[model samples]
Target: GSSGNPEDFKVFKYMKILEEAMENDTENLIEKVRGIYGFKVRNGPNGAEGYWVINAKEGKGKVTYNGGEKPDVTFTISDEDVVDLISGKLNPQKAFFQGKIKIQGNMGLAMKLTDLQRQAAGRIESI
Candidate 1:
C-alpha cells in the first residue's frame, strides 16, 4: 500500500507514540479501562483511515495497531482531533458535544476516556 498524503505519515507517528505509551504506561490509565475500545481516525479532506484497538481487563492493558475483534467502546474522530485529544488540547466531553468526536457502543465505558486523555497527555509530554 502506497499513499502520497503527508498526513498519513502523521498517523503512523502517532501510532508509534501510542505504542510507546502502552509499553511504558506508568499512570495505570489503561488498567482502568477494563474493556475493549476501538479507534477510527481519519485524515482531513482526502481521508486516510487509521484503526486501533485498546484492550484492558483484569488490571492489564494492551494497544493493538489494527482492528479485528469487537470492541466495547469505539471512537471515530479526525486526525487533528486525535492529536489534540492525545495532546490534551481538546477535551473529550467537549469534543463529543461539539461533534468533533463520535463514540459508538457502551456510553458508560466511554466515560473512561477522560482517564485516557489524562494519561495520554502526560505520556506525550514526557516523550
Candidate 2:
C-alpha cells in the first residue's frame, strides 16, 4: 500500500510510469484513446493537488503530473483507491461499480480505460 504523502507519493510514482508507456507508442494510443483523461487522487498527505493526466489527444501524446493541459475527462478517485486500482486489488470496472470512480463533465472515456491500461501494460506488465 502507498501513503498519500508527496514524499510518499507512491501512487503518483505508480502513475508516473504510465507516461513511459504512452511515449513508447503514441500513434497507437492516440488512435485507441482519443481523449485526454485525468485521474484525480484525493486525500493527499498535504491535501495538496494530486493528479495525473494522460493526454492521448495529439502530438505523440503526453502525461502530465499535477496539472497540465486540460482534460476531456477526469476520473476522481482517492489516494487509497488509486493504490488499490493500480495494485490490481481493484479493477477499474469494479472500482466504478463500488463507487470508487466518478466522472463529471464527460463520460464514455471511463469505458475505454481498458485500452489505456492495456497500452500501459504493454510497456510495464505491473501497471
Candidate 3:
C-alpha cells in the first residue's frame, strides 16, 4: 500500500497487495467476506487495465492480478482513487456516494468489504 507516487502506482500493485493479504488470510476471508469479488480497474498504466477477481466463496481463497474471470460482485474504480480506497483514505461510502466508484452484484456482499479491507490493512502494515 505504501509506495512511490500514488498517481503512477498502477492497479496491479494495489491488487497484488490485497491478493497477498487475501492469500495469507484465506480462511478468514472465506468465512468473513464469504463471496466472489471482481474489481474492474479503469484507466490504469497503458494496457494494464482489466478485471481482477478475489475468490473467497469456496475452496480456499485466491486473487487474480492481470485479466481474470469475473466474479459474483464487481466494482468499477479507477487508478486515480484505488490507492486511497485501499489505504483507507477514501471510504467506500463517500467514494460511492459521489460516484467515484460504481458497483454490481449483491448489495449485502458489498457491505462486508470492510472485513476484506481490514485484512488488507493488516498486510499493508507488515509490508
Candidate 4:
C-alpha cells in the first residue's frame, strides 16, 4: 500500500495498481524501460505527480519530484488513462495514437513503455 492520501487525488487510488504491476514483473519491465533516464506522470485533476527512475542507482519505485533534477522524459496524461492502462483496461498505444495521452521525453523510450506495461500486466495476470 502506498503511504499517502489517495483521497487527495481522484486518480491516486491507482498508484497501488501501478506499484504492484511493476513489482510483479520487474524483469519484463526492466527490459522495456531500462536505460530510461527518468519519467514524470502528471495528473492535472488531482495535482498529483509520479516520477519513476528506469535504472536507479539506489532506489526503485516512483517518487514525488520536487524542485530537483529534471527527468529525461516527462509525460502528461489524464489520470483516467493511467488507471485504465495499468488496470489492463486501456491500450496505451491506442490511447497515444488517439490523443488520450501526451509525452515529452525520449520518443523511442517513451514508445517502448507501452510494451513494458503490457508485459508487466501480463506477468501480473499470470500471478
TM-score for each model: 0.70, 0.67, 0.70, 0.58
In order, what lDDT does every prediction score? 0.66, 0.65, 0.66, 0.52
What TM-score number comes out for model 4? 0.58
**Poorly placed runs, candidate 1 (over 4 Å):** 1-9, 58-60, 105-108, 123-127
lDDT tens digits by residue: candidate 1, 1-127: 2224443535556655665675466666665666776777766435556677766644445557565768888788777777777776787779888977888746666576555667666554444
Q: Model 4, 8: alpha-carbon shift in Å? A: 2.5
> What is the per-residue lDDT of model 3 for residues 13-65, given as tens digits with 9 covering 90 to 100?
77676666665663555566677777877665653456667776773456664
Q: Summarize candidate 2's per-residue lDDT along 5-79 as a digit string, tens digits.
A: 554655667766655555566355556556787877776765654677777777345667765778888888877
Quick one: best lDDT, which candidate?
3
CA RMSD per model (angstroms) = 4.8, 5.1, 6.6, 6.0
Better of 1 and 4 by lDDT: 1
Q: How close is candidate 2 to the true structure, as a TM-score?
A: 0.67
Residue 85 in model 3: shift from native, Å?
0.5
Q: Which regions of candidate 2 fall more than 4 Å away from where they truly are?
A: 1-7, 23-27, 46-49, 59-61, 66-68, 104-108, 118-127
Report the error of model 1 at residue 60, Å: 5.1
